[PDB]
């Protein structure tokens, strides 16, 4: 089992934190917030680095380019913004969604961005030009998450409409719709690091690992509280192979991926833990919490 212990608490956002993400090169943590700001923090020491500003309304998600140089953020102002982290400049403002933008990611290559919106679509954008390339009529309710697979050829999306769908990046065609025996809102999805699986959260307090190719649910993770918020979930891969997620009882849950047992619960936050991220090389977890808390915490384990 891991032994995550609290190392730093990061204060600075003035409203609920919405997402935290570690840069691929391991140097930085980025955070986004309902306060319309992105903040950068040292990944190892928690030291505040800088604030990146410009959105007109709250931000629900932020994501790093694979070279750790750029961020993309998704906002209630109905835009995404692409940022040069070093200069703090907004390179492009991506206009096209007709309602709040909720989720975003670059492809592993980092020439494309995928976004999901309250407008029920998924859009794919050219990073260099900031132009929308394709609009997929993906869902019949808000899109909660979007993620590219390992080679960028597929996109997975999830929605309040109860579906996870997998899309061909190049053609835009729907290649698969995944749903289990009940239809709760799907609140998060992402491909596994090896690209074989999809990890999906549903708003019935459940995480599931699906074999994408087979269209089969292989593992269920339960024990946490998740009925209300779109809480991120992670694969922790630096030490033991875990699944990590925030929870609506203000804890971070960690499960053994293979056995599905809870291996640790991290206590310390004073509101719902909406987002967690796992460092790419060290056994470090960042967690972020909602309006009554407003902090980010860094936890470290020996394994």
């Amino acid at each position: 089992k891991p032994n995550y212990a609290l190392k730093f608490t990061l204060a600075g956002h003035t409203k609920a934190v919405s997402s935290v993400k570690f840069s691929p090169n391991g140097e930085w943590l980025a955070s986004s917030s309902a306060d319309k700001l992105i903040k950068i923090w040292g990944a190892y020491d928690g030291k505040f680095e800088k604030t990146i500003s410009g959105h007109k309304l709250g931000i629900s998600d932020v994501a790093w380019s694979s070279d750790s140089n750029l961020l993309v953020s998704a906002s209630d102002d109905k835009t995404l913004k692409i940022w040069d982290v070093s200069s703090g400049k907004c390179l492009k403002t991506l206009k096209g969604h007709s309602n709040y933008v909720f989720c975003c990611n670059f492809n592993p290559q980092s020439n494309l961005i995928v976004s999901g919106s309250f407008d029920e679509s998924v859009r794919i954008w050219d990073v260099k030009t900031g132009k929308c390339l394709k609009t997929l009529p993906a869902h019949s309710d808000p899109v909660s998450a979007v993620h590219f697979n390992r080679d960028g050829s597929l996109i997975v999306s999830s929605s309040y409409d109860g579906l996870c769908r997998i899309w061909d990046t190049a053609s835009g065609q729907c290649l698969k719709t995944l749903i289990d025996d009940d239809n709760p809102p799907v609140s998060f999805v992402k491909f596994s690091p090896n690209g074989k699986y999809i990890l999906a959260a549903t708003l019935d307090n459940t995480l599931k690992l699906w074999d994408y190719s087979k269209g089969k649910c292989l593992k269920t993770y339960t024990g946490h509280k998740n009925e209300k918020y779109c809480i991120f979930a992670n694969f922790s891969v630096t030490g033991g192979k875990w699944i990590v997620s925030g929870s609506e009882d203000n804890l971070v849950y960690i499960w053994n991926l293979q056995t599905k047992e809870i291996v640790q619960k991290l206590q310390g936050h004073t509101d719902v833990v909406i987002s967690t991220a796992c460092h790419p090389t060290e056994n470090i977890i960042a967690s972020a919490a909602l309006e009554n808390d407003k902090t980010i915490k860094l936890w470290k384990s020996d394994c």
Binding site: A16, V17, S18, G58, S60, D76, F102, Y229
Partner: peptide
């Protein structure tokens, strides 16, 4: 935003 609803 994600921090509501």
């Amino acid at each position: 935003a994600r921090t509501k609803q």
